[PDB]
Structure 1
Amino acid sequence: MTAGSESSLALRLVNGGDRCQGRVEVLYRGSWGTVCDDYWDTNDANVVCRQLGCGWATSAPGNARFGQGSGPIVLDDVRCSGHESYLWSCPHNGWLSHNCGHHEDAGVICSASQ
């Protein structure tokens, strides 16, 4: 990952009750995209929760549980071991390499969420 994208990458959870649950969105090339729910699981969620300082994964809802996003779908088939420090450190399909719709946008509920 080039130094420049590494500097600008960012993760957020949107449309939930607080910052520690919601639809997963990732900042790629200066635009916020969503993550497809294919093979999305608590291991992926766990990386997200820990990265955000949100504790550990409670659950990893697919099927746009927190609503459909509108950006590009930037991540798909995410295969986190659960140990990685950043979601972009997980194996995945490649940026923008998806076969999804926004009705599949992945979500997370973390243990620090209230």
Structure 2
Amino acid sequence: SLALRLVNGGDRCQGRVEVLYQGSWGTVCDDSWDTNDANVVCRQLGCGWAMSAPGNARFGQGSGPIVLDDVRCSGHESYLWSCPHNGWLSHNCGHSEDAGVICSAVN
């Protein structure tokens, strides 16, 4: 029912995090975004371990929905949406804060 991708990284294993929610791709706010969250993304995609969890539109800004904020993974989960989060749809954040990952399998 949900899906996850990275965009604008020049490689499938780094880029801006996007989640398909209710049929539309949205971004993730960087307010609580850390390497625990990035490790979950990298594992879910088959991309190894997280080298970094860059914020502030490191891979550009999205232009539509912002679907998650305040994501707080322990780091061991198998899907980003399985981590604790404050519901769906960010009412707090703008696209200046869109979150990214860089995974070890980048090549």
Q: Deviations over 1:44-103 (max 9, x none)?
A: 000000000000111000000000011200000100000000000000111003411001
- Note if contact 1:13-1:25 (Cα within 8 Å) is conserved in structure 2: yes
Deviation at 1:17, TM superposition (A): 1.6
Structure 1 distance, partners of 2:106, 2:23, is 27
For structure 2, the residue ranges without an aligned partner over 5 or more in a row are none
Q: Which one has a larger percent helix, Structure 1 or Structure 2?
A: 1
For structure 1, the residue ranges without an aligned partner over 5 or more in a row are 1-7
Q: TM-score, normalised by structure 2?
A: 0.97
Match of 1:23, SS state, is: strand
Structure 2 distance, partners of 1:43, 1:53, is 16
- Note if contact 1:74-1:98 (Cα within 8 Å) is conserved in structure 2: no
Structure 1 distance, partners of 2:51, 2:31, is 18
% identity of equivalent residues: 94
- Note if contact 2:58-2:99 (Cα within 8 Å) is conserved in structure 1: yes
Deviation at 1:39, TM superposition (A): 1.2
Structure 2 distance, partners of 1:113, 1:101, is 28
Aligned length: 107
- Note if contact 2:29-2:90 (Cα within 8 Å) is conserved in structure 1: no
Q: CA RMSD in A?
A: 0.7
Deviation at 1:104, TM superposition (A): 0.1
Structure 2 distance, partners of 1:74, 1:15, is 18
1:104 equivalent to 2:97? Answer: yes
